[PDB]
Design a protein around this ligand. Sequence first.
Ligand SMILES: O=C(O)c1[nH]c(=O)[nH]c(=O)c1F
Ligand SMILES: O=C(O)c1[nH]c(=O)[nH]c(=O)c1F
Ligand SMILES: [Zn+2]
Ligand SMILES: [Zn+2]
Ligand SMILES: [Zn+2]
Ligand SMILES: [Zn+2]
Lengths: 356, 356
Amino acid sequence: KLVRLPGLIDVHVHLREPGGTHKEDFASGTAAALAGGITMVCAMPNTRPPIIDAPALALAQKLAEAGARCDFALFLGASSENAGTLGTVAGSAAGLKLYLAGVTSVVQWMEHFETWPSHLPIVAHAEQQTVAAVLMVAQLTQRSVHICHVARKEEILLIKAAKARGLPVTCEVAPHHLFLSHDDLERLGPGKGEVRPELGSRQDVEALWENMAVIDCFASDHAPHTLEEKCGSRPPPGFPGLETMLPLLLTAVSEGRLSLDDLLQRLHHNPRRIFHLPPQEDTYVEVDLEHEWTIPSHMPFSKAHWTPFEGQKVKGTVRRVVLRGEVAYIDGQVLVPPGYGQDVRKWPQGAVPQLP
Amino acid sequence: KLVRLPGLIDVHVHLREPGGTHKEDFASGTAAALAGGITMVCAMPNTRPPIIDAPALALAQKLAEAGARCDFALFLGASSENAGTLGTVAGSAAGLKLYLAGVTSVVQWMEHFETWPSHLPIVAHAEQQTVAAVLMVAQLTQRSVHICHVARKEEILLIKAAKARGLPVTCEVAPHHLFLSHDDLERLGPGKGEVRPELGSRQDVEALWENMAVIDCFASDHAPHTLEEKCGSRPPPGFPGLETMLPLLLTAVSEGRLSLDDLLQRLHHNPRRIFHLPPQEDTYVEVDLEHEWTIPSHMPFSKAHWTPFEGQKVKGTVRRVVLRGEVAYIDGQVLVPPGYGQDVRKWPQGAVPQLP
Ligand SMILES: O=C(O)c1[nH]c(=O)[nH]c(=O)c1F
Ligand SMILES: O=C(O)c1[nH]c(=O)[nH]c(=O)c1F
Ligand SMILES: [Zn+2]
Ligand SMILES: [Zn+2]
Ligand SMILES: [Zn+2]
Ligand SMILES: [Zn+2]
C-alpha cells in the first residue's frame, strides 16, 4: 500500500538560526523537513548574523551540526563587501546566494560571478526583468545560474526562451506558486498573504503548470515567521512550507497533473545534479497515496505555527522516513535527535569535483 | 594531482554474452568498463539468444551475476511477438530497447509503447526520420522516450525542436560521433569503419558539439567485434569504446570544449535520473588530467582487440577505481574478480518507483 521514494531534497529553506530562533531553528526546521519527506536541506544565508563571511559560516556550521535532524548544506550570501574573499570557504557551502530583490548594482553582480569559483553553484532571487538581467550577467561571465522561486508567466517563458537558445540556466518553483493565487488573498489577508515573490494570477499559476517541462526543481522556500509577525504592523514576507510541500504535490500526482517521475526529478535528481549533492546511504521515504485529509491551521513541527494552505484537501501523506539506516520519522513523531544531521559538503562524495 | 569523480555510468553497451563470447563476455567487457572509469553498465539485449523473453533474461542475469566485475542492469528487447508479455519481468530490466534500424511496423512500436509499463524506460535505436517517427509514437501514447546514439545534425536539431515544445525526450551521443568523421574513413577502411549509425560529416560532428546542451547522456555504444570480423567478408557494424570514452572526453575537457560538470552530467547524473539507477556506495574514480598518451592499436581489456581511435592523442587517464569499498582497478590492472558485480535492479534503491 505504501510507495517507497528516495530521500527528497529541498534546496531552498530558511531555518533562521542564528538570530531568529523564535521563528524556527535547525532542530525545529529539520523536524518539519523530515515530516515532509525531506532528508536533505540547503539553508539560506539571510540569518542574523548573515552568512556572508567565514566566521559566520563557521558559527552556522556548528549550530547546524548540533541542531539539525536531517542532512544539510549551508549557502553563503553575496554582499557588497565580500566578492573575492570567499575562495577558501566557497567549496564548503551549498553555493552562493545572490539576493536581487547587500548588493545594489549589476556591477556587484558581475564581480561575484567573476570571483566565485566557476565550478560552484550560484542561485539568484530574481523577479520579473531581474531574471533577464542576471541571465545577461551569467552570459557575460560565461557560466551557469539557477533562478529561485519562479512565480510568473513572464519569468517561466523567459527561462524557456533561454533554454531554447542553449543557455545554462535552471530554475525552481515553490508550492505556493503552483497551488495558491490571487484568488486566495481574500482568505489569507494582506499580512499572512505577504510573500516574495508575491502570489500570482490564475494565469501565472496556469503558465507554470503548462510549462512544467521548464521547471527543474521544486523547493519550498520555507520562510517561517510567527503568526504575530505575519499579522503585525510590518508583516515580513514568507510562508512555511516544508510540511505541506510533498502532500500538495502528491495530490497533484494522484490527479494526473504530473507523474511520480516528474515529481522525483524535481525533488531528488535535479537538486542532486545542479548542486552536486551526494547520495544518502540507507535513506528512503514511505508515503501513503490513498489517505485524504484537510490541511489544519498549523502543521505540527514548524515554529511558524501557521500555514497558508489551511483548508486545502490533500491526498497523500508521509508515513515513515529512514535516514542513514535510522528511523527518523513515523506518523507524526520525529525520532532522531537534534544533531543527528550532518553537513553533506564534509562527506568525501559531497565535495564538488573540480580541475586541480 | 588526481581528480576524484563519482562512479560513471555507461547506459549503452553490448557485452555479447550469451552467444557471442569470442567478441566479449561479461568478465572482459566489465574489465574494459572499469579501466575506462565506468562502474555501472546497462547491457543491450541483442545477444544469442536475444533477451526478448523471461527465460532468456533469467539466463543472462545469472551469467552477468557470475561474470560481471562492475555493477549492471540488463535491457529487454522489443520483438514482433513479446508485446504485452513482459509485465512480470519488466521492472527487473534496465528498460526496453526498440531496435528501429524483430519489429517492422510502426503499429508494433505503438503496441510496445502501450503495453510496456508506463513508468519504465524505453530506448530506441532510431536514425534520421525514424527519430521523428518514434517521437510521434511516444506522443500518441503520451509517454517519454530516450533516443540512442544521435549522430547527425538532422537528428540533434529535431530533438532540439521537440525539447523546445516541452516533449519528454532525452538522448545520448557516442564518442565516435564526436571525435571521428568521414575524414577518418580513409584510415579506418570500409570494414573497420562500419558502424551504425555511420560516421557523420564534419558538419554533423560540429553540430553535435554546438548543440551539447541538447545531449543528455554520453554512452559508448560498446559494440565489440573481432578484427577478423570487422575486416572480413561481411563486416558487422560497431566499435569498441569503453576503454577510450573517458580519455577522449577528458581531453575535450582539458581543451575547454566542455566543462568537467558538463561531462559528469552526461556520464553520471543524467544516466541515473533517466534510467532510475541507484547510487553506488563507497564508489569513485581517480583520473590524472595531465598525462599525455597516444591511443594504441588495441586497448588491453576488450576482446575486440582493436580500436578506431588508434593514433589519436589524448590527455587524461584513469588511475584508480574503487567499487563499493574495494579497489577494482589500478594503472592497467583489474583487481575485482568476475562475479563481483551485481544487478542494480535487485537493490531496494534500484527498483523504479511506481504508483501502487
Ligand atoms: O527570508 C525570508 O523571510 C524571505 N521571505 C520571502 O517571502 N521571500 C524572500 O526572498 C525571503 F528571503
Ligand atoms: O550489436 C552491434 O554490434 C551493433 N553495432 C552497431 O554499430 N550499431 C547497432 O545498432 C548494433 F546493435
Ligand atoms: Zn527569495
Ligand atoms: Zn528564500
Ligand atoms: Zn544501436
Ligand atoms: Zn547498441
